[PDB]
Design a protein around this ligand. Structure first.
Ligand SMILES: Nc1ncnc2c1ncn2[C@@H]1O[C@H](CSCC[C@H](N)C(=O)O)[C@@H](O)[C@H]1O
Ligand SMILES: O=c1[nH]cnc2c(O)cc(-c3ccc(F)cc3)c(-c3ccc(F)cc3)c12
Ligand SMILES: [Cl-]
Ligand SMILES: [Mg+2]
Length: 213
C-alpha cells in the first residue's frame, strides 16, 4: 500500500464516521507521529477556517485534493446548499479523497473531479453549470498557480470579490504568482505567515481578492 492508503485506513480506524473534526484530527496525528504528508495542516488550516467563516462562500473551487484533508476542512464549514468542487489529476488520490469525504459524511457537499486543472477549468461553465466562483483554494503545484489564475480570468469564472487563497507561497514558494497578484490592480492581496504543515519551517498563505478586469 501507499502512504495515502495508510492515511485513509488510519482515519477509518481512529475517527468517528460522520464527524469531520475527528477526521482532521486523525490525519494530523498520523502525519505528525507516523508519516509526513502534504496536507495543508492545522496551523495553516486555522487561517483557512477563519477565511471561510468570513466569506461564507456558496461555491468553492479547490485545485489539488490529495487525500481530502483540505476538502474536509472547507466543506465542514460550508452552509446548507453550498458546494465545493475539487480537481485532482491523480486517480488514486481522487479515489482516496472520495472515500475520505464519504467517511466524514460530507459527500453531498463535494464533487471530486478527476483530471488536470488546466483541462477542467474551461469545462466548468458548460459541463459543470458554474457561473462564477466565490472562492478558489490553490494547492496543486506551484508552477500552475499563475497560469491557472489567468485561465480562470479568461474563462469568466472570477467576479468582483472572488477570493483566491494560495498555499505554499513561501515553501516551496510561488514567486511568479506572488509578483503578479501583488503588482496587479485586479487583485487586493494579504499575506498570512504561518508554518509548513507538521514542521517548524515558515510558510504562508496569500489571499488575493479579485477586483474585476
Ligand atoms: N494540474 C493539476 N490539476 C489537478 N491536480 C493536480 C495538478 N497538479 C498536481 N495536482 C494534485 O495536487 C495535489 C497537491 S497536494 C493537495 C493537498 C490538499 N489541498 C490538502 O491540503 O489536503 C496532489 O494530489 C496532486 O496530484
Ligand atoms: O506540491 C505540493 N502541492 C500542494 N501542497 C504542497 C505542500 O503543502 C507542501 C509541499 C512540500 C513538500 C516537501 C517539502 F520539503 C516542502 C513542501 C508540496 C511539494 C513541494 C515540492 C515537491 F517537490 C513536492 C511536494 C506541496
Ligand atoms: Cl500543522
Ligand atoms: Mg500545500
Amino acid at each position: 500500500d501507499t502512504k495515502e492508503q495508510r492515511i485513509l485506513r488510519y482515519v477509518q480506524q481512529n475517527a468517528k464516521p460522520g464527524d469531520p473534526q475527528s477526521v482532521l484530527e486523525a490525519i494530523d496525528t498520523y502525519c505528525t507521529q507516523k508519516e509526513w504528508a502534504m496536507n495543508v495542516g492545522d496551523a495553516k488550516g486555522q487561517i483557512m477556517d477563519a477565511v471561510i467563516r468570513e466569506y461564507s462562500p456558496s461555491l468553492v473551487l479547490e485545485l489539488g485534493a490529495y487525500c481530502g484533508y483540505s476538502a474536509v476542512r472547507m466543506a465542514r464549514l460550508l452552509q446548507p446548499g453550498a458546494r465545493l468542487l475539487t480537481m485532482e489529476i491523480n486517480p488514486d488520490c481522487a479515489a482516496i479523497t472520495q472515500q475520505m469525504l464519504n467517511f466524514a459524511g460530507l459527500q453531498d457537499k463535494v464533487t471530486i473531479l478527476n483530471g488536470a486543472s488546466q483541462d477542467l477549468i474551461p469545462q466548468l461553465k458548460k459541463k459543470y453549470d458554474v457561473d462564477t466562483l466565490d472562492m478558489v483554494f490553490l494547492d496543486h503545484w506551484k508552477d500552475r498557480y499563475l497560469p491557472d489564475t489567468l485561465l480562470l480570468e479568461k474563462c469568466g469564472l472570477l467576479r468582483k470579490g472572488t477570493v483566491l487563497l494560495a498555499d505554499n507561497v513561501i515553501v516551496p514558494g510561488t514567486p511568479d504568482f506572488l509578483a503578479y497578484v501583488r503588482g496587479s490592480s485586479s487583485f487586493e492581496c494579504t499575506h498570512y505567515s504561518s508554518y509548513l504543515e507538521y514542521m517548524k519551517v515558515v510558510d504562508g498563505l496569500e489571499k488575493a481578492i479579485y477586483q474585476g478586469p
